[PDB]
Design a binder for this molecule. Structure first.
Ligand SMILES: CCC(=O)Nc1cc(Cl)c(Oc2ccc(O)c(-c3ccc(C(N)=O)cc3)c2)c(Cl)c1
Ligand SMILES: CCC(=O)Nc1cc(Cl)c(Oc2ccc(O)c(-c3ccc(C(N)=O)cc3)c2)c(Cl)c1
Lengths: 293, 297
């Protein structure tokens, strides 16, 4: 059965890529746009964007390996390894023309390498609410004068001994609610049913582990990206970031400027980290307009 | 009942201070030295140092409010509030003479205010392995090129909704072993037996909660110390830090130089955060020698 409700006119389906059965939800007609979710979530965070975007594009939203209904990666969880699966998946549906990429949160981590290495395959790029893993992440503070910092979980999740799985097991719903809301400006959008759905999904033991394995591979991703970044991105790029509590603000664009030649950026006041849910209407509009140019 | 074995010729006792029953272990004879433990531990971390000190000093090792066998504080958990309990306790056993102070980890947070506010009561001072709460702690990284950073737990522990209690309760022994060993260079000293003793103590629900309340009061302690630090410490001071994995390295001395006029520091190689256990011989020697420069025996 489906973990999340599929919007009318879309199909939930699977493709094997490099021996890994990936789940995705797909609909629309026209050139391909792939939407990639991040931590704590699945394809479903894009469910409000999808029907609108489907009016002009074929839309595909995969579950990251090990998350949602996708199988764990057989290679590893570093960005360069995971990006392979997402690239090949996109190419099954757009073998003959470039496709657009939209990524949120660790979806960025898991797509940047395939973008920079296959630039001819990427027409336009939208990145929102996560740093590309580089040495900038080592400057983020453990603790702040206002208390709990925004990224202390980097260390919690990266820790060995399965620290995170062990503490969070049986308390997935409680932990996820805290994590989402502490990174949100608009908390009201996360209803009990929505949180139930997400918690149920990432609580599958292989998915709870998959979640943290992305973070255990984070330093490897940074090292990979140090080499990859020698080539700047040449395709038109737009960044989005929340300007409210939990958001990344000016960091998103300012980082991307070091990576891309052709970038525009927006900061959305009153919005936190979870842009597609906290601020669906302006986020959708900005993405649709940027891609429809 | 005793959570930890009391060394021969020491007494385990309790003292009511401002409505709070504080547990302590005491022995020896001579001028007073108070030893103040930190997070994850109790008076017991000092148990190898104590019989050696007791040959030259009256030694007292209290359990911090809410930890070990001490009741939670009734005022609050900021450094300034908790310091009142420890200062009054010490002064009961040394009402007419200054005493010595040795503090490890959050023992520092909980003693600094009474040291700076009662400088004449403190003859000599030894601080090891924690920052004094100030704005420097806002500069420590959440994540490092080597993996989990050394103070990410500050935010974990300080988070609202009782995040840390809810996640950790029932898994106290697991968490502690990871926490201690990840902050250690010499991990081998933390036997399963020793980890069992410590975990048993902080698994007491009021103790697990008290542990975190110290971090929930950290910003307040930072604000308190900003005022208090306008006057430097005048008594002889020594800092110790671990040079190995989990230790604070040169940070300890460098921060202290901003706080004290008279400070000598040591960084112990091959030792991490838990100096009394990981590096017992050199640490004990450094502490005994430093305190023995003054009146004793
Ligand atoms: C511009 C520099 C500055 O002065 N401050 C600053 C400080 C920090 Cl902690 C910072 O990082 C941020 C912020 C807000 C955030 O929601 C996040 C964030 C949260 C979760 C993930 C996840 N799924 O792994 C990734 C990321 C990071 C950024 Cl981007 C900027
Ligand atoms: C990368 C930045 C850099 O240049 N230097 C640096 C980096 C870090 Cl992560 C750092 O933090 C450290 C180290 C060693 C430590 O034992 C601690 C530490 C751990 C727990 C407590 C407790 N009271 O719970 C107090 C203290 C912090 C220190 Cl002091 C310096």
């Amino acid at each position: 059965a489906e973990e999340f409700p599929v919007p009318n006119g879309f199909e939930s389906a699977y493709r094997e890529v490099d021996g890994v059965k990936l789940h995705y939800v797909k609909g629309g007609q026209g050139p391909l746009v792939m939407l990639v979710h991040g931590f704590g979530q699945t394809w479903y965070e894009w469910h409000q964007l999808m029907p609108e975007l489907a009016k002009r594009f074929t839309v595909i939203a995969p579950d990251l390996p090990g998350l949602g209904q996708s199988e764990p990666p057989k290679t590893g969880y570093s960005g360069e390894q995971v990006a392979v699966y997402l690239h090949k998946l996109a190419r099954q549906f757009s073998p003959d023309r470039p496709f657009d990429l939209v990524a949120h949160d660790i979806g960025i981590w898991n797509t940047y390498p395939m973008v920079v290495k296959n630039q001819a395959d990427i027409a336009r790029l939208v990145y929102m609410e996560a740093p590309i893993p580089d040495a900038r992440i080592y400057r983020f503070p453990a603790f702040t004068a206002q208390g709990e910092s925004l990224v202390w979980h980097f260390s919690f999740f990266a820790a060995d001994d399965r620290l995170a799985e062990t503490l969070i097991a049986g308390k997935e719903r409680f932990f996820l609610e805290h994590f989402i809301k502490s990174h949100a400006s608009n908390t009201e959008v996360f209803s009990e049913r929505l949180l139930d759905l997400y918690a149920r999904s990432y609580a599958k033991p292989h998915s709870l582990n998959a979640s943290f394995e992305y973070y255990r591979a984070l330093n490897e991703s940074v090292r990979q990206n140090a080499e990859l970044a020698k080539t700047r991105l040449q395709m038109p790029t737009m960044t989005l970031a929340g300007g409210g509590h939990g958001g990344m603000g000016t960091f998103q664009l300012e980082q991307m400027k070091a990576y891309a030649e052709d970038v525009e950026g927006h900061v959305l006041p009153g919005c936190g980290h979870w842009l597609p849910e906290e601020c669906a209407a302006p986020m959708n509009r900005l993405v649709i307009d940027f891609l429809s140019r």
